[PDB]
Amino acid sequence: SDAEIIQLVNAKHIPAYKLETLIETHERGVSIRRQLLSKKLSEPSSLQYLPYRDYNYSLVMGACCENVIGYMPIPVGVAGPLCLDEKEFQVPMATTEGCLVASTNRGCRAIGLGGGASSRVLADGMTRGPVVRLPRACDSAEVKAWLETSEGFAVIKEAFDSTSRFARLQKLHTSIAGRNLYIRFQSRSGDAMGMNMISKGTEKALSKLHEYFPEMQILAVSGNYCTDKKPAAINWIEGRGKSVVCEAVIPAKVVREVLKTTTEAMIEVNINKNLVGSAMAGSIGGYNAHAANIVTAIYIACGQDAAQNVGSSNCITLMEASGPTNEDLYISCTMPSIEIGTVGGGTNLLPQQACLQMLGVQGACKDNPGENARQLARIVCGTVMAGELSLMAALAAG
Amino acid sequence: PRPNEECFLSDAEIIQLVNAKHIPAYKLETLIETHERGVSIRRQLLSKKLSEPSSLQYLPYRDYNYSLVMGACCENVIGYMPIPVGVAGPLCLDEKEFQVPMATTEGCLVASTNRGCRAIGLGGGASSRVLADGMTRGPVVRLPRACDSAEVKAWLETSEGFAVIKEAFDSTSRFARLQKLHTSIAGRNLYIRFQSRSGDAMGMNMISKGTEKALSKLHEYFPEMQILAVSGNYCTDKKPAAINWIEGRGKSVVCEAVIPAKVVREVLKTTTEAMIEVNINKNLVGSAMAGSIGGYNAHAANIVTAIYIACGQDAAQNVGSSNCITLMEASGPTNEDLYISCTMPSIEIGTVGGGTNLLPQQACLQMLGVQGACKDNPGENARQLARIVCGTVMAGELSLMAALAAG
Amino acid sequence: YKLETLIETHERGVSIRRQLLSKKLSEPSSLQYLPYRDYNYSLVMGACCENVIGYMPIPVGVAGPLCLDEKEFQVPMATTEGCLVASTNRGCRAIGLGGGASSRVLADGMTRGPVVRLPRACDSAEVKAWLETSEGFAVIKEAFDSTSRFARLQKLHTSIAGRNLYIRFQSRSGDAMGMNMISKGTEKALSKLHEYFPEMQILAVSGNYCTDKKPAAINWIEGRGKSVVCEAVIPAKVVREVLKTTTEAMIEVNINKNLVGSAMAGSIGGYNAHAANIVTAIYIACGQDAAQNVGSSNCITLMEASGPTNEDLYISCTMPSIEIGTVGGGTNLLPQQACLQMLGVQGACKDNPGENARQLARIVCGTVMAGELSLMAALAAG
Amino acid sequence: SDAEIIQLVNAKHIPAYKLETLIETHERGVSIRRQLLSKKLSEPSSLQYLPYRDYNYSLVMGACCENVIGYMPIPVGVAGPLCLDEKEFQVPMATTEGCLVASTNRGCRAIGLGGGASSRVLADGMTRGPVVRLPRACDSAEVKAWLETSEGFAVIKEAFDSTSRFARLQKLHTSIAGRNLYIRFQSRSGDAMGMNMISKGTEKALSKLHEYFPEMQILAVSGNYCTDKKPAAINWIEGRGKSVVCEAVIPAKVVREVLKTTTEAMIEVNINKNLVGSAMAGSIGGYNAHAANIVTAIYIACGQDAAQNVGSSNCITLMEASGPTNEDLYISCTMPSIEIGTVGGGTNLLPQQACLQMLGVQGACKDNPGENARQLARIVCGTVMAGELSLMAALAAG
Ligand SMILES: CC(C)c1nc(N(C)S(C)(=O)=O)nc(-c2ccc(F)cc2)c1CC[C@@H](O)C[C@@H](O)CC(=O)O
Ligand SMILES: CC(C)c1nc(N(C)S(C)(=O)=O)nc(-c2ccc(F)cc2)c1CC[C@@H](O)C[C@@H](O)CC(=O)O
Ligand SMILES: CC(C)c1nc(N(C)S(C)(=O)=O)nc(-c2ccc(F)cc2)c1CC[C@@H](O)C[C@@H](O)CC(=O)O
Ligand SMILES: CC(C)c1nc(N(C)S(C)(=O)=O)nc(-c2ccc(F)cc2)c1CC[C@@H](O)C[C@@H](O)CC(=O)O
Ligand SMILES: Nc1ncnc2c1ncn2[C@@H]1O[C@H](COP(=O)(O)OP(=O)(O)O)[C@@H](O)[C@H]1O
Ligand SMILES: Nc1ncnc2c1ncn2[C@@H]1O[C@H](COP(=O)(O)OP(=O)(O)O)[C@@H](O)[C@H]1O
Ligand SMILES: Nc1ncnc2c1ncn2[C@@H]1O[C@H](COP(=O)(O)OP(=O)(O)O)[C@@H](O)[C@H]1O
């Protein structure tokens, strides 16, 4: 009985968050936690409109969230078709911002009428940047030099790669700050975003390094040199996750008819807003109009870590006069740090798997590991370009 | 399936009609009785275009209030995405207790934040202050020459020129109160940063309306001025920028607490000394080595994002809203207690408008006691929400830093 | 270093200091080619340098005439980089043939950004709010301005980091670069603030929030010292004949190097080709603090197609933080005063203080634009 | 004859700079240029105090400066001894800032009394970052991938390495912006700062690349991706020229007696000024008190390119409690991008060679090429640390 389970908890016997570790069902656990919580609110009827029934909590519990009191529905709209690399995509966008999906759809239209967009993945590798300390700067310098010898690296790479199937440690980037040493480990991770995997590899690699340098202190597995979820020039300059570039040419006629402006006006707005304005504002990596809007909408729809829009949104949007008469619009978007995955985390949930299926990238790519994640990154970059096209045209037209 | 001329009806018939008269899918809301069937039909149309027609099987869409969404929050709707909502608390802040809703799919985040809240509560709670409040829009205009743009800048800096602009700006809404103007010249280009409070609304739309009218007025004084774009990226909205870090955008907030040494050992499993050492070398030195502007924290974006999604905020705004510098130092008689503070200069937030107009997110705002407009004191609900965000970020910083220091 | 505190002649003290030093060198004959004789050490001693062992001669070249704001300037440039003066001179030529350049000073105010601490963040917030009120500012201004006839406090920009409070004081300073003057005003203003908030601890008169001699977005965004903009239009014919290239090629190089390249490199304020070269050469020649080229060099160079045929080159250079002065420091020495006289800006402008320093800042911006023009043409031609 | 040269030049409109080729002696050509110039000044007697006589213009002409009208004397002071890596240095500083030499000397004293400082060169390599363009982003991506293959690199390295003896192409860091491709070439350069040498190598390497990709357009030999003389995160994160770290421990007694403060006060000032203050100001690389002051003074004295203090001054100064009682001051300075040389440019002049000799690093190192330049970089970092120590103490003291 609910009432007596509530009475049993209000006897200080069970901590509110320890409900599923007792109640014979998930949804009922959620229901009781809600009742307990309501008594603590200045307005006990607050949760009335927060849904919770008929949701598959099995996949959520012990994997995606804790102290669950329900779920938050985010409207999902569709933008497309997105003509990219000779394929057509119907892009799911979870958002509460009016006109965003419509504007992106218009961008997609202009691209399709232009013969489509092309994209390339330039680099792939998630990172973790721990910070270690030596007794002296002279010692940290010795460690840095050691890590730079082919033998020292092979040893570290062996330890790193030995923690998982996908741990393939690439180049190692190090930076010294006195006796501190920041080490940026970079590795592919199949179709997973890879933070957990890279962390495991990093911990074992640091153990191995410790055998060679017993005086080394592991201060933190993350010394903010990754850099994860904080703006940083290092991600912009070296990339993090997937580095992608996309491009398209919009015929003058399409710019006039679909976008309601001219190539010349677009170019002038892009230079003075996305380049000069961002420069005047002191931006590192924010040379675009609204890439974060598109990245965020797709991330939420596809079960990505939305907090990662911080670095994933880095983007430089470039526009140029093209064609016989210099009236056609050449556009490109370069995104050096798209942190994305199609396996793990929120991608394990069914509704988000549905959005990934819609794009044909759900789960692991059996025949070619990482291909689904790479495809998703290309789709993001292409949709960002469609969004940039549309909003820039609107700003150009006034 | 009836012939098209004969063709409220049958699904297959609407589809056959749609295909034939080539009606775009998004116009379905204005062609079908219920909203739900509108999406149902769009889903069916879409499924035929997918390499795997059964893709949408697990994407929910039934029994959702689309009335509030249509023509306001989203277009081409094919359903909704459920994000798990967890609760962290109580958060003892400014002598009140908050139960904080967090929408996320990252395991252990809610649990970790809850631990942080616990440590704070056992320490006597946290205190916070709103330092500044004002959303911005930074349009770019052009004059024929740099000499002319300089003239405009100087004019905008005279008390009379400003009053004129402020009058035009303020005439657009009750809450539109032009605070100040920061201008910057790049040759003949002139970037003008308009800043104004906006009641309890995040305020982008309102500030934009005010900016357009103010630019019209400015145009009367300088007919040769060309309005290149209502946003010249000088706001700066949704892109990382030093200007938001240095001047603030939306709400600037600071939060602080002192964690007793005993609580650091027992709840956080570490020492004040270890925490301090990790904070300095990760949040300060590490962020400096990585070339960060505004990212002097461990994971403020995780907390900001989770609360934003739960409360109907614009999640894309976590880009600048997440700016934060986390500081830690020895406190107390024995210098063994942990003093901690989080300073967030640019929290873009609102409790009225946008996604906050939807019922499920209004529920999360009600849970915090900040839903909608504050009748008695306009903007107070939005300011309270910003303080809550900064306080929860501090709880999250406390917990994650402890785990990093510890093992 | 106490030699001129004892001995009679300055030149002798230097000879002796050299002798003493000589004993400690692994090559005592090294000082052989370091000059020291016949130099006026009187002005240097106790003002510009200590432990003096001589002087370092830097070649001074001349670029000009620089046609700026309907005047012509012969610009002195101290440098050891070959072709720099020649390249800048070519830039000046192109500008002169284009009808000259125009410039405007947009802002003027040196800064000092001390860091203070309160017991709690709640207290530092209280101090910030007090500082933003008209009465609070008036008293701090009253205190700041009482230290000098030239010190006039313009505004205050404050920033909180928990219980720390960074306060950026900004004030004009006549024709002086103004660091010393602003520091004096800041110390007195902080004393006054302390009377209102006794629990406040003055951690450092400079908390790096000024920001002096370190790259910082704050100087780029708010300006520091003099903010200046310069512009000119170069006729298509002049671009072809003097610069050996086309307007179209120049524009393409400027966008992809100065804008896109600097963006890819993660630059804050470095959207130019080589402004530091010009700033440094003029600073050394004119007795400025050369270490200040760090922020003084901030610059965004922009190029556009201009004219009826859209074949003429429009160019502009915007420099938000030129830290400069024509009185004090190295400007007190005769050789550098000679370079300032050459420009007609030596010493204080008695009638309107600040005018000589403002004129010098315009000259720097104009010369930087001449240098940008020439080097970009050379990069575009290839 | 003097006055007759004037009439001739004015009569044929012979450019002043051409005087060198005209006259015989260098000084007479300078004397005449001054006379010509004086007639054009609002105050003809302006040059009265600008020296020009008895200076060796032979080395300057056609190498260091043009349109010469004299020389500017900068006072040279000495700070030392600087106890670094078990050696003692007498450091020449050219400056007009009062108390700078005195303050730096005090810093040196505290270090000496602490048993000296230790330093290490972490990396060495000057750079040039040209920008090239391909017709499409898909093509620039192809070029990037090609440059990353071991065969493509070897080919480029061969072409680069063939322009000089010291040209040893280390690595390549590439970055795409749509159809633009920025390529950062990095190479050691013996004891020379290396800009000219690296530029030569870059031009030839770009020619070779053009043979493989005929559609590639070389937009500019420097696309600002080097980055030379402009502030940039890339130099901070990847280094440029010499990356150096220096450290020392100052006994508590020495901190009290020589520096007039406490270790605790120093530490508090360093954290809140050099770390937090610089962070609040939005600095990239400026986590120090006044490294630029020391870099500039030494650069001018030693014939370095003073405009390079822009990036050479990047520095992070760190302080912490050390010793048994935790009362001694540990200090370190890390400078990732010291652009320096002991051969070429202004180092070819005698007075500056004198300052380099004073340090024992003048010219090339026959047996260990680059050693003199590396030694000079360590000296700069060590002196910057002495300057940081002293000024921080005075700020801490009040
Ligand atoms: C529905 C959206 C796409 C959006 N749509 C439109 N349009 C008029 S539209 C539907 O035709 O594409 N306009 C703005 C808009 C943007 C800036 C502005 F000043 C006024 C209006 C935004 C606003 C977009 C906002 O999220 C980000 C934007 O602020 C970033 C920036 O440019 O700085
Ligand atoms: C559940 C979360 C809070 C999280 N929790 C924990 N814990 C062990 S916990 C549950 O005690 O708070 N640890 C990490 C973690 C962080 C860094 C690391 F190297 C390994 C693991 C993260 C990871 C959090 C991640 O999203 C952001 C993080 O990457 C930011 C950064 O510090 O750079
Ligand atoms: C005499 C000088 C002005 C100089 N002159 C010339 N010329 C060809 S010139 C005399 O005709 O103006 N070219 C370079 C030069 C510049 C970049 C290059 F890759 C190769 C050569 C420099 C070199 C310039 C150097 O100081 C700064 C420069 O590196 C800044 C940058 O553009 O990144
Ligand atoms: C003679 C010098 C070493 C110098 N010396 C001294 N001293 C008191 S001293 C001679 O004992 O070392 N003090 C300052 C000084 C510094 C900051 C201040 F607010 C007031 C005075 C400077 C000023 C130094 C200046 O060039 C750089 C400095 O501004 C960088 C910064 O700290 O931001
Ligand atoms: N509600 C919407 N949903 C999706 N796309 C939309 C929507 N409204 C406009 N668009 C986009 O804008 C384009 C045309 O816009 P417009 O000329 O305003 O006509 P309309 O809005 O009636 O379709 C469409 O082709 C489509 O890409
Ligand atoms: N599943 C969870 N949901 C919410 N909060 C949790 C959860 N697990 C732990 N916490 C938080 O972390 C704190 C630590 O609890 P636990 O890990 O059981 O260790 P301990 O028993 O040593 O306190 C709890 O007080 C609570 O605030
Ligand atoms: N040694 C120099 N000193 C000063 N200016 C020079 C020098 N050499 C060239 N210049 C400048 O550079 C421009 C180019 O002239 P020059 O070098 O003769 O080449 P060109 O044959 O292309 O005209 C001239 O306008 C002149 O002002």
- Whether B267 is covered by a domain: the verdict is yes
Ligand nearest to the CA of residue D261, numbered in listed order: 4
Q: Cα separation of D278 and D297, whole Å? A: 23
Of A190, A225, A241, the residue that ends a domain is A241
Amino acid present at A134: L
- Is there a binding annotation on residue D108? yes
Distances in Å between the Cα of A202 and the Cα atoms of A117, A126, A163 are: 38, 12, 9
Structure tokens at D222: 């420097």
Give the residues across from D286 on adjacent strands: D315
- Angle between helix A371-397 and helix A100-112 axes, rounded to 10 deg: 100
Please work out whether the CB of residue D289 comes within 6 Å of at least one atom of ligand 4: yes
For residue C51, which of D91, A54, B81 has the smallest C-alpha distance? D91
Residues 6+ apart with CB under 8 A from D69: C60, C61, C62, C76, D30, D33, D34, D37, D47, D50, D52
> Could you give the 3-state DSSP secondary structure of residue B70?
strand
> Could you give the 3-state DSSP secondary structure of residue D155?
helix
Q: Please provide the distance, in angstroms rounded to a whole number, between the alpha carbons at the two ends of chain D.
A: 63
Q: Cα separation of A311 and C268, whole Å? A: 18
A90, A97, A106, A108, best to mutate for ligand 5 pocket (most atoms within 8 Å of CB): A106
- Angle between helix B35-47 and helix B11-20 axes, rounded to 10 deg: 60
**A131-168: buried (b, 16+ CB within 10 Å) or exposed (e) per residue?**
bbbbebbbbbbebbebbeeeebeebbbebbbebbebbb
Q: Would you give the DSSP letter of residue A18? A: G
Half-sphere exposure of D38 (CA within 13 A, CB side): 16
Which residue intervals of chain A are DSSP H helices?
2-9, 26-38, 57-60, 100-112, 137-148, 150-161, 195-212, 233-238, 252-257, 263-269, 276-280, 291-301, 309-312, 350-358, 371-397
Task: Note whether D72 and D60 are within 8 A (CB).
Answer: no
Q: Cα separation of A225 and B285, whole Å? A: 9
Cα A74 from chain centroid (whole Å): 18
Ligand nearest to the CA of residue A291, numbered in listed order: 1
Q: Cα separation of C291 and C322, whole Å? A: 12
Amino acid present at B120: I
Residue B255 belongs to domain spanning: 84-132+251-406
Q: What is the CATH number of the domain that holds A372?
A: 3.90.770.10
C150 CA: distance to closest CA in chain B (Å):
22
Catalytic residue among A20, A228, A238, A305: A305
Q: What are the φ/ψ torsions at residue D259 (nearest 5 degrees)?
A: -90, -5
**A24 and A86 inside one domain:** no
Q: Is D14 on the interface with C (CB under 8 A)?
A: no
Q: What is the CATH number of the domain that holds B199?
A: 3.30.70.420
**A102 and A55 inside one domain:** no
Task: Note whether D318 and D388 are within 8 A (CB).
Answer: no
Query: Are the Cβ atoms of D287 and B288 closer than 8 angstroms?
Result: yes
Structure tokens at A255: 């710019």
Q: Cα separation of B16 and D291, whole Å? A: 75
Q: Is B163 on the interface with D (CB under 8 A)?
A: no
A67, A195, A339, best to mutate for ligand 2 pocket (most atoms within 8 Å of CB): A195
SS3 content of chain B, % helix, strand, coil (to 5): 45, 25, 30
For residue D303, which of D222, D243, D372, D382 has the smallest C-alpha distance? D372
Q: Cα separation of B124 and B339, whole Å? A: 12
- Angle between helix B146-157 and helix B159-170 axes, rounded to 10 deg: 80
Task: Note whether D156 and D275 are within 8 A (CB).
Answer: no
Q: Please provide the distance, in angstroms rounded to a whole number, between the alpha carbons at the two ends of chain A.
A: 62
**C206 and C290 inside one domain:** no
Which residue intervals of B130-267 are DSSP H helices?
146-157, 159-170, 204-221, 242-247, 261-266
**CA–centroid distance, residue B404 to ligand 2 (Å):** 8
Q: Would you give the DSSP letter of residue A90? A: E
Residues 6+ apart with CB under 8 A from B401: B275, B278, B279, B282, B283, B298, B326, B328
CB pairs under 8 A between B and D: 36
Half-sphere exposure of A269 (CA within 13 A, CB side): 27
D284 CA: distance to closest CA in chain C (Å):
7
**D387 and D337 inside one domain:** yes
Cα B363 from chain centroid (whole Å): 18
- Angle between helix D371-397 and helix D291-301 axes, rounded to 10 deg: 140
Q: Cα separation of B393 and B323, whole Å? A: 11
Q: Cα separation of C215 and D233, whole Å? A: 11
Task: Note whether A321 and A267 are within 8 A (CB).
Answer: yes
Q: Cα separation of D393 and D263, whole Å? A: 9
Please state whether beta strands A68-84 and A315-322 pair in parallel, antiparallel, or not at all (unpaired).
unpaired
**C311 and C190 inside one domain:** no
Q: Is A144 on the interface with D (CB under 8 A)?
A: yes
For residue C169, which of C227, C196, C209 has the smallest C-alpha distance? C209
Q: Residue B285 is nearest to which of D233, D275, D285, comparing CB atoms?
A: D275
- Whether B1 is covered by a domain: the verdict is no
Amino acid present at A158: E
**C373 and C239 inside one domain:** yes
Q: Which residues of C are annotated as a binding site?
A: 87-93, 148-150, 175-183, 242-244
What's the burial of D138, exposed, middle or buried (CB within 10 Å: 0-12/13-18/19+)? middle
Of D207, D241, D275, the residue that ends a domain is D241
Ligand nearest to the CA of residue A294, numbered in listed order: 1
> Furthest-apart CA pair in chain B: how many Å?
88
Query: Are the Cβ atoms of D95 and C48 closer than 8 angstroms?
Result: yes
> Could you give the 3-state DSSP secondary structure of residue C231?
strand
Of B83, B107, B142, the residue that ends a domain is B83
**C29 and C66 inside one domain:** no
Angle at B313 between CA B311 and CA B315, to 5 degrees: 115
Q: Atom 17 (ligand 3): residue with closest C-alpha? A: D222
**CA–centroid distance, residue B116 to ligand 6 (Å):** 10
What's the burial of C333, exposed, middle or buried (CB within 10 Å: 0-12/13-18/19+)? buried
Q: Cα separation of A387 and A295, whole Å? A: 10
For residue A188, which of A164, A208, A224 has the smallest C-alpha distance? A164
Beta strand ranges found along A159-227 (DSSP E):
168-177, 180-188, 217-220
**B213 and B292 inside one domain:** no
B290 CA: distance to closest CA in chain D (Å):
7
Q: Cα separation of B182 and D303, whole Å? A: 42
Please work out whether the CB of residue B403 comes within 6 Å of at least one atom of ligand 1: no
Task: Note whether B362 and B385 are within 8 A (CB).
Answer: no
| Element of type H or E holding A162 | none
Contacts with B153 from chain A: Cβ below 8 Å: none
Residues 6+ apart with CB under 8 A from D222: C257, C273, C379, D128, D129, D130, D131, D228
A155 CA: distance to closest CA in chain D (Å):
21
- Angle between helix C179-196 and helix C121-132 axes, rounded to 10 deg: 110
For residue B117, which of B128, B108, B125 has the smallest C-alpha distance? B125
- Whether B3 is covered by a domain: the verdict is no
Interface mutation vs chain D, best among A124, A146, A176, most D CBs within 10 Å:
A176
Cα A17 from chain centroid (whole Å): 29
Q: Is B146 on the interface with A (CB under 8 A)?
A: no
Task: Note whether C281 and C79 are within 8 A (CB).
Answer: yes
- B236 upstream amide cis, omega within 30 of 0: yes
**D194 and D147 inside one domain:** yes
Q: Is B347 on the interface with A (CB under 8 A)?
A: no
**C381 and C260 inside one domain:** yes
Give the residues across from B302 on adjacent strands: none
Query: Are the Cβ atoms of B81 and A73 closer than 8 angstroms?
Result: yes
Task: Note whether C354 and C108 are within 8 A (CB).
Answer: yes
- Is there a binding annotation on residue D337? no
- The domain total for chain D is 3
A126, A225, A228, best to mutate for ligand 2 pocket (most atoms within 8 Å of CB): A228
Angle at D137 between CA D132 and CA D140, to 5 degrees: 45
Contacting subunits of B (3+ beta carbon pairs below 8 A): A, C, D
Q: What is the CATH number of the domain that holds D70?
A: 1.10.3270.10
**A159 and A224 inside one domain:** yes
**D118 and D131 inside one domain:** no
Q: Cα separation of B47 and B56, whole Å? A: 7
Cα D187 from chain centroid (whole Å): 16
Q: Would you give the DSSP letter of residue B334? A: S
